């Protein structure tokens, strides 16, 4: 009968927790900034567009020097995008048409992907043929892969569908670590500036912040009321957004333990699939289901703009590093450039 | 243009031509989605052609077929199934020799995902080849046991036909909107190869109506 | 990565001669490849070029109209047709890959060559050193100098730097003005602006007497330099 107690203790812990944050909560940011000067409106138009794709682009990701992006389709197809002169650099067939997500090395020497088949394959770009050979196929993961991040060229940390996170190292090809607590499927995955910690977003309407080297979930935050499609870092590190299929963004802060903003619209039916932040952090950018991104003013929680133009539902959007940019992958085969 | 420019222009056209090409080479490619429960059975329906999800290829009447299994996946499968929202059908494996097994009964379990696949948001056009398995065992099995446990509103004759129409009319009942879909209903005999074949039939339905949309009168 | 090189010998004036090369360890389709010769006393100069897929081909003007080259890439292998020889055309052949799409590395790989002997504007790229002694141990600037500007528009100057040693074919050290090559020891750095450009060895060691050259790739027939030669 020590069930009932246990499950009476976890009430009691959660109280608590909940008890030191509204302690821990005196006044919103909405209060603070209702005196700071908005922007009326951002306009931001089609540069580029990346042809080429025959089905819906799943991924996308940026380089390190803003100016070479990956794009994954489910035909099979990963093209690496010179974006300043619209360019195809690499065009590399994959074993399984089935991704979901892509990465970028940092240094840009690999790149990743995964999905339905359970394997992340790291293909290496530099060799001395001039073709793009796979690299190593890591293994063990009894869900699709839903994302994956560089930790750098030899370690690498993946999202998958059985409620698991894991961290490689991809010389072995082993998993270094393994994080476990999620209860639903984790969906997103984002590495902070500093590449120590990391929070991912499930479907048990959660988002957990775990440390790399120790391997335990720091904090766990629950404000959403359905599954969390997106997750992303504010630049500073101590802030992140989620997008989730209850049609709201949620900012969350980490010292704080809160959710600190709310973005959500009676317009708004649709769920949000990606987000992105802007360089300092001003500027919020979410590619929902309605076949367009809205970019919202992260300290005023008002819809600063419109991304429209794709033909059908916005499944990725990136901004550079620079913050030149933003690209986003829709399901009609097409990427486009926004400045 | 410096020169490296242009070749670099000249190696962007070569694997544009590349990527067209093989875009042609898979649109003229047939996509099936295999379904079923565990022990429904289909390891029957793929042996008769001579981790993660399967691909098997084959070629029927100079016609190339994939079809993908999805078994293996035990994740929510509202997060990856519009994915196979381009397949040209989707087969679905039911048991007729679980009725009485309960593993729940099972097959009704089977019901509930019939149900939840072909109402499914995805599929909304997409055509169900619903094959019923283990029809021996059905006709061994019904001699003795009845189909009150599956079914309390049978009130029909406790014979292998009665029985296996009853069976079919309750899985076609769960179509709802089937003006716009088409539920393929065959019987699967394990000695004999013209499974496969009503499968092509089925399939070229779907290309002729598909080519109705092509021309503009579908 | 092999570029083996086949055919050559001795013939006579107004002959003709087709010069072989079998490719080995590479994608020998997705490259470009350039015949480059050198004269048995002098310095290096371009001959021609065959682009990926056949579709692009160039001659320097001295060979126009008498030289064809092409490209068999199931047998993985790369042709010139020479006709209506001449005392000019007596020299050792290269054959070289290049690929080229952005943060590319061209003229990476050189073949042996094959030697050739026959019975008896653009721009200027000048290299004013010749000859110069060196010490183990002690940093060396080598010059060179062009006739047009060759910083594009793009950000990017189209100056390649090799090195040839004593017997030996000549390998790729610098791609454009400041990029080190795969292999390259942390040695050797480029620098420069506008028409004259440095390559400076900080540290010199007993493996790097040879002569090395400067060609442009901004525009062709794509001119090489005269000989630096340090040997000491």
């Known amino acids: 009968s020590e069930l009932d107690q246990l499950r009476q203790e976890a009430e009691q812990l959660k109280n608590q927790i909940r008890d030191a944050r509204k302690a821990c909560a005196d006044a919103t940011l909405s209060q603070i900034t209702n005196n700071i000067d908005p922007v009326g409106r951002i306009q931001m138009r089609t540069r580029r567009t990346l042809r080429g794709h025959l089905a819906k682009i799943y991924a996308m990701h940026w380089g390190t020097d803003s100016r070479l992006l990956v794009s994954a389709s489910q035909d099979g197809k990963l093209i690496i995008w010179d974006s300043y002169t619209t360019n195809k650099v690499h065009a590399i067939p994959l074993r399984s048409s089935w991704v979901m997500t892509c990465a970028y090395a940092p240094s840009g020497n690999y790149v990743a992907c995964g999905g339905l088949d359970n394997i992340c394959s790291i293909y290496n770009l530099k060799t001395r043929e001039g073709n793009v050979r796979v690299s190593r196929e890591l293994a063990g993961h009894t869900g699709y892969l839903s994302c994956c991040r560089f930790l750098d060229d030899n370690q690498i940390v993946t999202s998958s569908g059985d409620t698991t996170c894991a961290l490689w190292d991809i010389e072995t090809g082993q998993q270094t670590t393994t994080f476990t607590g999620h209860t639903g499927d984790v969906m997103s995955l984002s590495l902070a500036p500093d590449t120590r910690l990391f929070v991912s977003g499930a479907c048990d309407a959660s988002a957990k912040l775990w440390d790399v080297r120790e391997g335990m979930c720091r904090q766990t935050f629950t404000g959403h009321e359905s599954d969390i499609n997106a997750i992303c870092f504010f630049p500073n590190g101590n802030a992140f957004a989620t997008g989730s299929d209850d049609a709201t963004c949620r900012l969350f802060d980490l010292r704080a333990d809160q959710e600190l903003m709310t973005y959500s619209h009676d317009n708004i039916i649709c769920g949000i699939t990606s987000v992105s932040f802007s360089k300092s952090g001003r500027l919020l950018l979410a590619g929902y289901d309605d076949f367009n991104c809205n970019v919202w003013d992260a300290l005023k929680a008002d819809r600063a703009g419109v991304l429209a133009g794709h033909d059908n539902r916005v499944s990725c959007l990136g901004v550079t590093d620079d913050g030149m940019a933003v690209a986003t992958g829709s399901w009609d085969s097409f990427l486009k450039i926004w400045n | 243009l410096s020169a490296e420019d242009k070749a670099a222009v000249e190696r962007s056209k070569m694997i544009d031509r590349n990527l067209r090409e093989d875009g042609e080479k898979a649109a003229r490619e047939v996509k099936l989605l295999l379904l079923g429960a565990g022990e429904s059975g289909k390891n029957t329906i793929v042996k008769q052609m001579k981790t993660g999800i399967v691909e098997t290829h084959f070629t029927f009447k100079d016609l190339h077929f994939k079809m993908f299994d999805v078994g293996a996946q035990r994740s929510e499968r509202k997060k990856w199934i519009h994915c196979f929202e381009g397949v040209t059908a989707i087969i679905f494996c039911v048991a007729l020799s679980d009725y009485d097994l309960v593993l729940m009964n099972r097959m009704h379990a089977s019901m509930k995902l019939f149900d939840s696949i072909c109402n499914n948001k995805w599929f909304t056009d997409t055509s169900i080849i619903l094959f019923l398995n283990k029809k021996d065992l059905f006709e061994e099995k019904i001699k003795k046991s009845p189909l009150t446990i599956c079914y309390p509103e049978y009130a029909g004759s406790n014979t292998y036909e009665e029985a296996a129409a009853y069976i079919q009319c309750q899985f076609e009942d769960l179509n709802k909107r089937k003006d716009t879909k088409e539920i393929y209903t065959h019987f699967t005999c394990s000695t004999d190869t013209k499974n496969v074949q009503f499968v092509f039939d089925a399939v070229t339905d779907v290309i002729i109506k598909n080519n109705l949309k092509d021309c503009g009168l579908f | 990565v092999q570029l083996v090189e086949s055919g050559g010998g001795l013939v006579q004036p107004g002959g003709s001669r087709k010069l072989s090369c079998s490719a080995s360890?590479?994608?020998?389709?997705?490259?470009?490849m350039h015949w480059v010769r050198q004269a048995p006393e002098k310095g290096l100069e371009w001959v021609a070029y065959?682009?990926?897929?056949?579709?692009?081909?160039y001659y320097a003007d001295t060979v126009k109209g008498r030289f064809t080259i092409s490209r068999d890439d199931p047998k993985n292998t790369l042709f010139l047709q020479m006709t209506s020889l001449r005392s000019e055309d007596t020299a050792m052949y290269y054959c070289?890959?290049?690929?080229?799409?952005?943060?590319?590395?061209?003229?990476?790989?050189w073949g042996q060559g094959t030697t050739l002997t026959v019975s008896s504007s653009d721009i200027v790229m000048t290299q004013a050193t010749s000859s110069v002694p060196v010490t183990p141990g002690e940093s060396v600037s080598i010059s060179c100098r062009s006739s047009?500007?060759?910083?594009?528009?793009?950000?990017?100057?189209?100056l390649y730097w090799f090195l040839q040693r004593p017997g030996q074919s000549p390998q790729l050290l610098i791609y454009?003005?400041?990029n080190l090559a795969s292999g390259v020891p942390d040695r050797f750095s480029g620098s420069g602006s506008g028409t004259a450009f440095t390559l400076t060895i900080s540290r010199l060691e007993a493996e790097d007497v040879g002569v090395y050259y400067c060609?442009?790739?901004?525009?062709?027939?794509?001119?090489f330099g005269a000989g630096t030669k340090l040997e000491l």
């Open positions: 070289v890959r290049s690929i080229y799409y952005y943060g590319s590395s061209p003229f990476d790989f």
């Open positions: 360890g590479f994608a020998f389709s997705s490259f470009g």
């Open positions: 065959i682009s990926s897929g056949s579709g692009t081909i």
């Open positions: 047009k500007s060759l910083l594009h528009s793009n950000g990017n100057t189209y």
């Open positions: 454009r003005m400041s």
């Open positions: 060609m442009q790739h901004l525009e062709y027939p794509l001119t």
